[PDB]
Amino acid sequence: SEFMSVAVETFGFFMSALGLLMLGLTLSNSYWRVSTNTIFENLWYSCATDSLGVSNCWDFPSMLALSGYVQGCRALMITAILLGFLGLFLGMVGLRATNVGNMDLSKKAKLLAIAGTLHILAGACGMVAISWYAVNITTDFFNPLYAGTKYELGPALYLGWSASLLSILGGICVFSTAAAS
Numbered sequence: 001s002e003f004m005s006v007a008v009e010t011f012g013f014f015m016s017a018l019g020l021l022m023l024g025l026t027l028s029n030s031y032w033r034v035s036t037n038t039i040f041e042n043l044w045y046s047c048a049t050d051s052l053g054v055s056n057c058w059d060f061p062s063m064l065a066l067s068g069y070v071q072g073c074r075a076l077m078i079t080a081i082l083l084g085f086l087g088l089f090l091g092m093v094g095l096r097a098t099n100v101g102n103m104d105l106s107k108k109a110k111l112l113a114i115a116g117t118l119h120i121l122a123g124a125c126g127m128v129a130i131s132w133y134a135v136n137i138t139t140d141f142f143n144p145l146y147a148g149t150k151y152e153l154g155p156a157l158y159l160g161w162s163a164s165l166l167s168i169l170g171g172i173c174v175f176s177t178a179a180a181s
């Protein structure tokens with residue numbers, strides 16, 4: 001019975017770590033959306049590939065981010081990564097075999113529950129940011145009246161959606177094992 005708890009604990013911990021790492025990869029990924037020249041943007045840069053092949057990038061203007069949804073998506077992604085770091089750290093200390101200080105199993109269980117919640121919240125923040133970003137792009141693309149540039153969903157959004165799910169599912173596992181102590 002103890003093996004099963006440890007296995008799920010270990011599994012959930014590595015899932016959370018994987019989700020956090022991918023969240024960081026998502027935030028720094030160049031392809032949040034691509035013009036259906038060729039324009040591709042993330043939360044930080046707006047770029048353009050001119051004929052033929054040459055690509056240039058400019059910083060995503062802060063007023064544009066503020067007047068839109070980008071600055072909000074920035075805040076949710078940054079929060080998610082910070083929460084995931086706090087969760088990874090506390091989760092690492094909360095593992096059964098871990099000897100950082102000299103805490104009993106009960107104190108470890110409390111830490112795992114906190115770490116578990118942090119990963120769930122991190123996945124939630126990432127989930128909202130990706131979805132918020134995605135809906136804005138999708139609404140414009142399928143709008144006949146929309147005169148502006150139309151974008152496709154970028155690969156990073158599928159990476160972020162996966163990352164968030166991994167964080168949530170991982171956090172659930174860690175939290176479940178914590179409740180059993």
Ligand SMILES: CCCCCCCC/C=C\CCCCCCCC(=O)OC[C@H](O)CO
Nearest residue numbers: 020021022024025027028044045059060081
């Ligand atoms: C174990 C966990 C490991 C993974 C966790 C990694 C956390 C950091 C990764 C990405 C954050 C940075 C994303 C890219 C930041 C770009 C900053 C930039 O150059 O911005 C230019 C300008 O300010 C824009 O307007």
